[model samples]
Target chain A: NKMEAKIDELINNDPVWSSQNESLISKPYNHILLQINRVMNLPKDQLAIVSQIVELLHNSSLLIDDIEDNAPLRRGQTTSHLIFGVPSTINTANYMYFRAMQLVSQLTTKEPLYHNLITIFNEELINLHRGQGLDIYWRDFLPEIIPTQEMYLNMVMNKTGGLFRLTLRLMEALSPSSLVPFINLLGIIYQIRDDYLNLKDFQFAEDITEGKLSFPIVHALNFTKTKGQTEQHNEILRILLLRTSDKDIKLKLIQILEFDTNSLAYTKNFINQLVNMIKN
Target chain B: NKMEAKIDELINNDPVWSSQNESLISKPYNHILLLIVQINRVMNLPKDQLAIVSQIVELLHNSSLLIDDIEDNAPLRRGQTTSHLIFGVPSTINTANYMYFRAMQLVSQLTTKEPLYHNLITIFNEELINLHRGQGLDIYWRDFLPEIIPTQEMYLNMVMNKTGGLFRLTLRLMEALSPSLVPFINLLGIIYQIRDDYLNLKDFQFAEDITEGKLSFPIVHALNFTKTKGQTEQHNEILRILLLRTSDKDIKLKLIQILEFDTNSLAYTKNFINQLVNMIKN
Candidate 1:
């Protein structure tokens, strides 16, 4: 009860975290990073810093992504910028990203390992942003650029693979073992599953409302275009551009993916295959 | 022209940048980071690395100002419209944040020595966290208004975190790279921030801190003084005007007059600044 009251007080006092704003409150999520650390068997001393660094980057990115996508809910909670005002939210989120970078120093005292860690941290962040930038650009200018399967996969490699590779690379560098290939496969699998679940689990598939170019959407766009289904392609683009909250409109777009392009089934199969590759 | 076109295309295609936003960009008014880099004459960093270091500081500082203007809701920076005002907040934010990571990427080229590289990053990371912590408190006080009126001690501590951060960061990096000059830079940072707070009201036609209802040094002094002296009306008045967040000349003048006469907080602030600066000279 005291913990709850403390949380309530924090929410009440912090302009950015306040409950008054419908879009700004969220529970801190660090399960994946913690699980990854445990799986890697990172030193208990290093665990806190590693988990913190990833948490900062992941959370900060989500704040920015929500703003870019005009997403209203994140992890079933209001986005940060919605409550704090975009200006403060933007500043705070960016500030946290740098704060994460600061934790890299705590990860190691050895010079060579430190350098490797810094490089891994720096390069992966760059890749993440570059991929995110492309994803935003493509979605913003949809119908103008319908990415092929190869292009979509490449974008995913940079965007999703970025954080996954980042965590795994740092873990591998610290440990006496290498899991680069496996981690890379895991990252790809993680992203495809996330994209698939966005449609399957969430009501009306929030990604559709945000007009995201998700894996299924990307597949649907390309499949229709290649098969000379110009009308279907245009209609799909129209629904995405509409940024509709209407359940019927969203369902219409999902149906187009299911029946006309068979994208939903394809995405499911593709995820299964990637998982199989990992298992084998 | 071809080079220019290619550069333009590169920026245009990049989601974080836009060619049209070029006019909205500005240079840092204070070149303290570059000056520090140059002052370490003995270090003699190579041309490429020095250039990268310079770029890194420039990107961090300018991008910070862009977001700072938005957070403070200040209309002007360096006597020009803030970037957020001109480019729109969304684009300005993305661009600023994108540059931060870009700056982080440049640190790799600075040195190959693992120890030195680690130290440099530690210094960089430490200061950035300090800056955000300081800024967070400052923003919180203003937004929450009168919930927790800070003491003079608390106010200085905040400035040390917020204002001292970048100054210390630049010096620490240069120190790590070459010589240690932290004490001098830390002192200068305090003097700079206090002087800046003083001049905002003294020099400008409309002191933005007053308009934004910032809990600056002078304002903090006045609040603490009023509470101690049993001046409830004075305390209430100060809070009233701050919460008003007005641009009216009369209201701003009235608040300034109150600080000057009722508490002599402005003069107190000026003397405090002089004393801090004097510590360095002696």
Candidate 2:
């Protein structure tokens, strides 16, 4: 991908700009990419703690999400619940959430600074959970409520953007950016891209198996309904309700999105448009 | 219980205490009792805020149990069907987690003093982390089964972290608003856990902990005892029954029989709990 091209250039003729070393690593590659914001003024040590804190929240949420999703695989490995059982995995993930919270105090001990930081921490965690609650509620309830595109985007902003804002707000409380809005945009792009890939590129249409109210699925259902294509609309609902892993059935739904709704094209176009927001 | 008598006195001679119209209520009866700690000199008790903090504590404690029951996959909590069973796991998880934040928000209402507010929040955060750590260890030992048969030392440390969490949370916040009783409270927390673990085995016919495959106070002692005495057959059998996670009455009795006659673990635990209670008085 283009990401490969740019990174290849960076590695060969790497700019002398980093003035930083042993950056924190390949596992946290995206974390380093997001570090362009270090221009805003958090020192190296503090930036590192911010990195650690963000990673803790990200990975811990992954643990809980896998449990909530009843998912079996994560990053190409067995999910922790499968190994340790649900009880330990759930508690360990929760334990880590507070451990990350504990690290917030280390960011600064000054009362006023710590006060602002705590508020930032508290608000973003609330927002993240509120958004997560909406997403989980939507999926678990299923066709009980089909979220409109607008409704879906609002959920993503809260659910996904919660962490983005947390990282930005905490950094701002200390270093104080044109960052908040930009991070929000990146979160939207990231989640939608993830939704898109689960349907298009993953081993199976895992989202269909999950009965997830994903981006393309949302579009197809809405698109077919507006067009009065009742059969196609009902077919989508029926297959999702089955929560089937049958390759033929998953492919059939993908075809409906392709031929009748053109939802896949619309999602790719939407992602590119979101990415262009950064490019311009 | 003395707790009953103390609360009865509070309800009647209830010194210029507080009210919440329709508090946020029996479950919380004990939470209100903890308000006694608010009597201190570093600052006079702000009874309004103290009531609010008590609400936060009650909210956190009860909500945690809701999740705890679900995590353990119990059919009942206190002989009532678990909310997760009534509502389903997905909704229960979301609701309890939602309540946790709702409780966190209450901390802000506890005081306007920003410094004290931060300390209050930190205390909540720290104790919650401790509670989960303790719970995770307990779950880990049982779930893994024989992978790590925890020593009595390990088990006490885990109890101190797990049971001590809520106890310390309540006491620490009370003192922040108002101890020196942290150690005393800490001691009480350990005693409460050991006694509860003891009672789960002592009180029931089949014993809940055995069916749950828990490595309770006596179970841990007996497992270690079997190993120490070169009783391979007993050690292997005890581990196997716990792994069965059985409800079979004969099977449970068989294990308890081992603790009773062979290892003297039941007698050992009864003595241990008695001494912990005596430590409180003497």
Candidate 3:
């Protein structure tokens, strides 16, 4: 994919810059580099540098993520843990992850934007950790105790929404008026679609099976609670979670709850509304 | 424990922000609001809209990470897949990931400094991914690769050096300094010393027979690569992987030889020399 392709290119073109000095280093860097470059249209040098940095961080995060959460697949490929086993997987993930930041700092020394970019990233990075920590905390409790649909949404927002928000923010940071709210909305919408598609039968099994805490279900449940339909809603969700892997059951839950239509509509509306809410 | 302490302090001090909303409408909103406040010192509200935006992206991305990793304990705790299961963890990651650029844009728009910050952060983020992907690949090939003294050293670097390097880098990035040039060496020194002390003796039967990838001899090999020199270098690695794990040694041998390093001596020496030279230069 974009990540793999970009990383591969980075390896071939800029081994040191990409840090593919070691064997097997070639694969991840080359693949991710190409992916990052595809997202932007800057000159190859600048794009490679930027793409390399982000790709590295994203890779590092994913590695640690798998280790922390016990993940297996990465970008449709088996994870480091799966292939090399835990020690190497964990360590390698850490190494690459650390190197990513180091490389970024190197860029900072070479380029002014580099320093600014890292500072900007730090805040979100902290938020990401916080969101994940909150998610871990909330996952064990009963849904009834879940803060609120708003709270639930915020958790998802923080958990997943933070990154979407950052990408949009980055575009603006790069060039004034380079991207408008509409484009930003496009990204937000894409994330929402991604979330929903996972719950659907057609998507990868890992999508929902991975057990993400999505926005739609929370929204649906929250809306149900307001209707004083708590018991019924709870029953449906209880069954849904158990049957989440069952195609018929999952689809049925979506239908009976009216989640599919409402969620899709809400997400679409949310994006449109957001575009209007923010002015250029 | 540190995380627990920090979270506990947060819950105790910010009751209002931590207060449950009467209506669920602003539930998610409140989370972000609180998050914004918690991380406020790192983010300026008025001009650094990118920080606000990235906060959301970071929030979302972490959820995807939680789920995709099968962080069962966390999922069990949260009573749901962290945030991406039904929400689509992949998409969530993509969104959070994609937003890196958007965060840059807003910051850049506010001031040149912001975009510069965005660029630097983006690069740092990429480095994290590279380390991760590399780890993934290494894990995949662990079975195939020989675990000679040199290969063992390489493997150790892949795991410990690789990860610990990032920890050091985090400090450097935050401090606006370059990461430790000799981080690998520092880690090797400690790791080798520990391995030699406890794991080297043939009679030292460890707690577990075979760890996931934590071989008893491999541990010894790593220890010796630094301090001791052994003669079982060449065939030992091939014998080790085949005996401890499985036999996929031929391809590994080719790969290692092509790189012009033997599993026993050359690779470790090369790594050490490289580290020493680089550290000295830096």
Candidate 4:
């Protein structure tokens, strides 16, 4: 409800929402409008049912991720699997992905974005699965067989970060004249913040402990070898995986993370520099 | 490495995998032969990339489900949250659904199953999301509201059936003359067995305990009501939840469950069953 409310404020204030043929919008569709105007920035001329398309796709991905994570909580709340039971949560995610594509067909079958949505959406699903597969393989594979931290980061870029990229890519694909570079930059910002938020908040630490490859940590591990903290870092990660209590592991992570403030500072600075790059 | 070896064995057994058209059938696509045969039973096409499509889709789905479930005991498997960690093992299901649509798209765009694949694939995705939304809402809300057993069962059926239905439907759509009803029914049977196996097997019993919205008592409770059990089911549930060792409720709740049913006392089973139900309110 809070998310919807905030999105509404954006819609009421934004020109795109105002320009939409208000009378044409229907029940529950107004929800789509707020999301589209606020997030996707699809134009009014091509905006009929477009938000629904984006929302369906975006939401389905989130739901599937939540289920895949067996995450009990997300966004300060219990996850789909925790509430609905894994079976239902799984089925629901399944239904949503299928339904979202149906909406894609309904909304963009004739538009230029239609084929792109189909191709991108389908491929994204595959990438998401591959990311997951590599993840599972890494967790169970013999310690010697596990991929390097860099390889793991590549997987994160494909699975979690990829979604963030695709969000911007989708927006640009939908509205050609709109800011593509800006959107791409926004993807980086959004994902970095996403990674930051998860780490900062221990509320969903269980997801991390359960093998979620969150960013900064992924960077921390990969950069550790180069940063010369490989031994200490591996020990910390080992404690996190094996011996430490949930709360303790969370604190240990935060502590290890605090010791290496410079790397994060560099990443953040890099993100900041990206804006200047975009503008020039 | 083991999975790759398994795939290699499968590839060697199939002539299609051995032929020169093998580019269309690479090592990544070792599982396609089985999927193609199943698909052809429905699609009945002689010339199609069904082999590649089947294997990639299956492998992808399997991978997704593994990542989707909260894979226990890995600090950060695959650099993303493991599905097992977040949602637990069942989350692998989301991977399954994602692959379903992906497989559908491949089947649709590459060959004769385009229209059918498009429609079914889309429906599969929608049903999955709705199933999740509906179920997620309940889980989050359950802390505030009391949930009934029948309601829980209804929710379960809605989800499990939808998931199972899609699996079966996919099989049905794989071939030209495959009976839809037969595959769907078979799918349901498969799901039932899967669920039974999941519950009966005692792996990850701790997550299994907390993950569920229990009726607050188990069959032992029901048996206790009939004076057929050794003790009240409530005690057994508490025993299990408390790991039969801890008096600390909070700490036990955080631990992963070990379903060592064989090692535990017989009363533990009754207690576990009764744990499925709450103390008799009346």
- Candidate 4 on B177-247: residue-level lDDT in tens? 22334433333433343344345323433333333333222221232332333444533453444233333
Candidate 1 vs candidate 4: the DockQ winner is 1
**Model 4 lDDT tens row, A46-73:** 5765556567667655665665444555
Give lDDT tens digits, candidate 1, residues B1-282: 453343234322322323332322222222211275466586666667667767778878887887788777888777666765654555555566666777777777788776677677777787877777677778767876887798875676677677878877776676576534555565576678788889988875378788898998889999999999999999999999999979888889888889988999988998777766555565
Worst 10-residue lDDT window, candidate 1 chain B: B24-33
Q: Which is superior by lDDT, 1 or 3?
A: 1
* lDDT of all predictions: 0.70, 0.72, 0.44, 0.45
Better of 2 and 4 by TM-score: 2
* Per-candidate iRMSD: 10.3, 17.3, 12.3, 15.2
Chain A superposition TM-score per model: 0.83, 0.85, 0.66, 0.66
Error of 2 at A137 (Å): 1.4
Regions of candidate 2 where Cα sits further than 4 Å from its true position:
A1-35, A276-280, B1-44
CA shift of B212, model 1, Å: 2.9
Whose TM-score is greatest here?
A: 2
Interface RMSD (Å) of model 2?
17.3
Winner on DockQ between 2 and 4 is 2
Looking at model 1, residue A58 earns an lDDT score of 83
Q: List residue ranges in candidate 3 displaced over 4 A.
A: A1-21, A25-44, A59-93, A105-114, A135-137, A140-144, A161-187, A199-208, A259-272, A275-280, B1-206, B209-282
Worst ten in a row by lDDT for model 4 chain A: A14-23
B1-282: candidate 2 lDDT, tens digit per residue: 353343234323211211331121112222212334443344456768667867888888777887787777787666666776665576566557766766887888877887888889888997887787677677767877887888886786777778878887887788887626676666677677888887777675348688788889888899899899999999999988988878788888887778889999989998877766665586
Top candidate when judged by DockQ against the true structure? 1
